[PDB]
């Protein structure tokens, strides 16, 4: 705290409470007692705990029928209008698409749709496999995800 | 019809004004006027201005008929205090409270 280390009054004599800094945390406009610093809130996850979780989420998504496997999910033009349609016939509104290829046409077409997320089968995570109502995976993508979780 | 006149930030202290207000509480407004006229206080000159204004506030706006008016409510609140400094002996300083007040006369037929 910006201030001087001058003791505000003397220690004895004046009938005030004893103080020794204008920046003490008892005082107004000086000092947080245990002040924050920027910290790392990351946690360590074991790989067999991370892979055991994802194997246990994908096992539960076929239990509550929220995993739907497709064999291809592409869209011809990189247009949000077509994908907005690609999911009405599929009867989807809040969905996570997980593909194996690098489809940038499909990737842009869901960049504006809020409840639709497109991944690349390598960045699927805990919170994304849970916070979407349906998870739709292309058949080339579920081959890779089965592999990395052994 | 209750007719209010106020005098806000009256420069007399509220305890000094409340002494004069208890003289004209409930009196008929003609008898209340010459109680305040032969009362030798500074608050008597202040309160009489509000009562003479509530007398005209009644007969100009709400109606007429001075002679059946009565000082029904009369109450003095404490306004904001102006804080001043009196220097005392041996470097010491004190706080002077220039105490304002809020005089409210409610006249009523």
């Amino acid at each position: 705290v910006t201030g001087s280390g001058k003791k505000p009054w003397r220690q004895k004599g004046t009938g005030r409470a004893r103080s020794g800094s204008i920046k003490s945390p008892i005082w107004r406009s000086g000092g947080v007692t245990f002040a924050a610093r920027p910290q790392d809130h990351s946690q360590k996850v074991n790989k067999k705990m991370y892979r055991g979780a994802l194997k246990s989420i994908l096992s539960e998504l076929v239990r509550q029928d929220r995993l739907i496997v497709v064999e291809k999910f592409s869209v011809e033009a990189p247009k949000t209008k077509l994908l907005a349609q690609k999911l009405k016939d599929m009867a989807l509104e809040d969905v996570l698409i997980i593909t194996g290829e690098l489809d940038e046409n499909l990737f842009l077409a869901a960049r504006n749709l809020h409840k639709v997320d497109v991944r690349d089968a390598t960045g699927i995570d805990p919170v994304s496999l849970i916070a979407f109502d349906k998870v739709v995976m292309t058949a080339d993508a579920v081959k890779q995800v089965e592999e990395m979780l052994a | 019809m209750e007719t209010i006149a106020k005098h806000r930030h009256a420069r007399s202290s509220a305890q000094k004004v409340r002494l004069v207000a208890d003289l004209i509480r409930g009196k008929k407004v003609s008898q209340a006027l010459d109680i305040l006229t032969y009362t030798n206080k500074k608050a008597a000159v202040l309160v009489k201005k509000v009562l003479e204004s509530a007398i005209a506030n009644a007969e100009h706006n709400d109606g007429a008929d001075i002679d059946d008016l009565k000082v029904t409510k009369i109450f003095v609140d404490e306004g904001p205090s102006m804080k001043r400094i009196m220097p005392r002996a041996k470097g010491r300083a004190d706080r002077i409270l220039k105490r304002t007040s809020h005089i409210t006369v409610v006249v009523s037929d």
């Binding site: 009054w9 004599g13 004046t14 | 804080k83 041996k90 470097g91």
Partner: peptide, 26 residues
């Protein structure tokens, strides 16, 4: 002028250094 531009704190403490008579022993 009903504007109220008041003043502030305008000096510190002179002395609390004060009288000291009174003992029970020396």
């Amino acid at each position: 002028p009903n504007l109220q531009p008041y003043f502030s704190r305008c000096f510190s403490t002179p002395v609390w250094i004060s009288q000291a008579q009174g003992i029970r022993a020396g």
